[PDB]
Every structure is written in structure tokens, then in C-alpha cells.
Amino acid sequence: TKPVHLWTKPDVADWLESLNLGEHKEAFMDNEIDGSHLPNLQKEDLIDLGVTRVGHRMNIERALKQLLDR
Ligand SMILES: [Cl-]
Ligand SMILES: [Zn+2]
């Protein structure tokens, strides 16, 4: 599998699907979110991408901690 920094936009869509965060795929793709963006996303970016529910941002924050060992 690819290092995260090399994830294309669809690779991020696949990852979101895998997290049962599929309803965010279109926003992440329409906003040009690739693997290089994931380490840099702030809460305000996740809000701008339509991730308005606390639980769903916490799911993304949790997943990224394990992906990027932060
Ligand atoms: Cl949400
Ligand atoms: Zn959501």
C-alpha cells in the first residue's frame, strides 16, 4: 500500500469509506483533499469539508493518530 503522502484524492475517498465516513467523500474530493493534506488538516478545515458532527471529526482525528503515529 502507498505511504499516506502519495495518496491520490480517490485513495482518501477509499480510506473515508473504510472508516464508514462515506458521506464525506464528495466534499473531500470536490475540495481536492489528497494524502499530503491529511497531516495538516485542522478542526476548521474538517468543518469547511462538511465534518460538523463532533463524533465524525473525533473518528478522523483517532484514525490519523494511528495512520501517522501522532
Ligand atoms: Cl459530520
Ligand atoms: Zn460525518
Side-chain angles (χ1 to χ4, degrees), residues 1-66:
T1 71
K2 302 201 285 214
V4 173
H5 79 95
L6 297 186
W7 290 10
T8 61
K9 295 163 48 197
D11 289 336
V12 163
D14 295 340
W15 172 73
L16 285 168
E17 195 55 63
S18 94
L19 295 183
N20 195 36
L21 295 160
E23 63 248 88
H24 298 307
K25 295 188 306 175
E26 182 172 28
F28 272 59
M29 288 213 56
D30 286 359
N31 281 270
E32 293 304 306
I33 303 304
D34 59 48
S36 72
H37 293 134
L38 299 187
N40 304 322
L41 285 167
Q42 304 307 315
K43 172 188 175 166
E44 167 211 323
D45 304 315
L46 292 178
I47 289 165
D48 295 342
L49 292 160
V51 195
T52 60
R53 289 173 299 169
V54 167
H56 276 208
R57 292 199 297 279
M58 291 183 71
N59 288 340
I60 290 172
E61 294 150 22
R62 184 161 65 220
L64 283 179
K65 263 177 145 282
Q66 271 176 241

